[PDB]
Structures are given as structure tokens and as C-alpha cells.
Design a binder for this molecule. Sequence first.
Ligand code: MG
Ligand code: MG
Length: 89
Amino acid sequence: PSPEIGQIVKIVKGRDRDQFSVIIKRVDDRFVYIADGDKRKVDRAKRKNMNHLKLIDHISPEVRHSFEETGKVTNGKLRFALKKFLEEH
RNA sequence: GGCCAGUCUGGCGUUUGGUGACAGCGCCAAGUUCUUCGGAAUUGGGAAAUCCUACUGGCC
Ligand SMILES: [Mg+2]
Ligand SMILES: [Mg+2]
């Protein structure tokens, strides 16, 4: 399906491959921006062709809510979303 | 399959650039060429091409 804001992804291509990240912006049907709040923080988020990601069936409500209510997300909240995702899987 | 734009010796490491193939950086190796023997240049196949294998992105 379509990538969603706050969705967890596994990077499959690029030098950041095999890491987990969070979708923080959907440019169009092909390109997104991802960030993990650690080695790739929001202010320098990584542009990605969606075909170079694997969509994981987990969407963080805290990240999605933070964009709706505040228009942005903190690196702290990204790190929490990923750390919480890894614990449940 | 067609069209357009790209990538290149191998291994390990990589908070850097790139959507990506990759590149850059550190280390160990390999091929090619040159050498004043101290070293120097270079890296898919090709003498080379609007050429070709593989691979990457886009359109169909
Ligand atoms: Mg190289
Ligand atoms: Mg193609």
C-alpha cells in the first residue's frame, strides 16, 4: 500500500541499509523522507525512493499525532518510537 | 523488449555524499601500464566507438 507518516521501515538499499527508520514525510507516490532521531535526525532527514524500503506493519501513533498537532516531530520521539517498536518485535 | 540518464578490481570497516547501483575515507590484497628502482599513473569487457555484459534510477 501507500507509505504512511510514522510507519516503521527497514532500509534495503543505500549505505544506511539493514537499519530501521521512521517515515516522517511523503513527497509523492515514489519518494519519502525518513529519520531515526539518532544517526539520521529530522533536520537532515534522508530522502528515499520507497522502492528502497521495506514497509513494516507498524505505525507509531505518537509520531503521527505529533505531526498533526505540532507540524513536526522531535528526535526524542523518533528514538522512543523505534525503541518501543523493537521491544514488541 | 524500447527509450532516457547513470555505476564499475576484490575483502573487512565506515555517524560522510548519493533515491540508488555506488562513491568518499581507513586497512589488507589483485590486475594493467610506466619507471631514473625511489616510486608514478590507472581499474567492468574492449585499441576505440553514437559499441557491449552486469547492475542502478526514470518513462512505456
Ligand atoms: Mg572502488
Ligand atoms: Mg530498469
